[PDB]
Amino acid sequence: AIPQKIRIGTDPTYAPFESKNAQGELVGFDIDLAKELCKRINTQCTFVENPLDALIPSLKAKKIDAIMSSLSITEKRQQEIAFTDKLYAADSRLVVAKNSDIQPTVASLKGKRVGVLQGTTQETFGNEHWAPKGIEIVSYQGQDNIYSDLTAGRIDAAFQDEVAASEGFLKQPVGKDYKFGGPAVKDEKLFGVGTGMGLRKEDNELREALNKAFAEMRADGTYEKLAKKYFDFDVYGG
């Protein structure tokens, strides 16, 4: 029905969306979004932190009740779980050293190591369009160990969403020497064009009330205020 305590699973390795801080506290625009969605439907929310590859199964095991983890909405994920309406747009791009040639293409990526987070939409674009053409796909848990292997030379490109790379790495002094290398690779039916909150297919009423609550947060100006402490561009798109 509408559960009185909902357990939201998150992977806390993805700034600015969800990440831990000095005071250990969970922090980020997806965290802020869910806190506000929860008050608004008026129920107690607790966050469970797990790796992103474990969330979509924990949900089907009722170990958690929602997923908020910048989880992009895609045709394939949707033939297993349900999602709210679009919370904001996502785009994928590879990050490269400023001194590395590396392309969105089997050409200059041939025989290079691209790192992807396990469970993600770009781990699966990397296996279907890119490993057969000879570029090696290295999967990780913890988005922060991918950026850390990139700056150490261990991998040659880091593959993930644009705004997290941008805000969480390239605008930080550790990504000063790095850059996006190439466009966003285009695959609308694999990547999806936005993220949402993941929910079981059978919970139609907790899904309907989250959609209403979010709708309202976009119309009274609460979304624009929550977005503005992280972004100076329009995160939502349209």
Place this chain on the structure above:
Amino acid sequence: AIPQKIRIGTDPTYAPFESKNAQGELVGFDIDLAKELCKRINTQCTFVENPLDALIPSLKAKKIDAIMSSLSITEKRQQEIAFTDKLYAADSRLVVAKNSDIQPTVASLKGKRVGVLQGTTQETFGNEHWAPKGIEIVSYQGQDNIYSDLTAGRIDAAFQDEVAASEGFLKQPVGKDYKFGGPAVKDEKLFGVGTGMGLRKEDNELREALNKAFAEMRADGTYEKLAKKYFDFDVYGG
């Protein structure tokens, strides 16, 4: 400039204008009306919670920049803060238990304890019109503690505004044994004709602007849309 982020003070204990849900979300007609005014004014206002007898000092100490708290536009208060245009009408009535007397005569209040919210217009009238006359005026800090002491028999009448009493108490199942009653009590100087946002006299540009935004929420229909979430009659007047 014109301020980017405005502090708004509210006492959130005055259903149906401002109150909180179990999760702390500020809810009510005054909350809706502020947020649409902020959006149209293109400003980022935030709500600070404070007992209404603190709100006019807080705005003098530049800790808040606005008051939205069902504050009556009066001439006594017009001598030290400025107000916006009339947001909606306000009337004062006493709330009394069924038949149990304290009836339409000032003499029937002699020796009875009349509960009032501290800092209010009814408090100011109580001690001018009625406390010289042998009636006991008891001031409280949250409107909810005036209705629970009425119920418990610890005071004999509760004096606050008419729509708040009726929609927050009399039409709720705790208010079933109660009614309006007591002498008709008027003083146009002390009481409003209605309510406005209260601000500093110094910040005149915000008023022209909030005034403008309000004016157009009203020809456009967003006022009527917000009011019908709450009232089945004209809250504005005519």
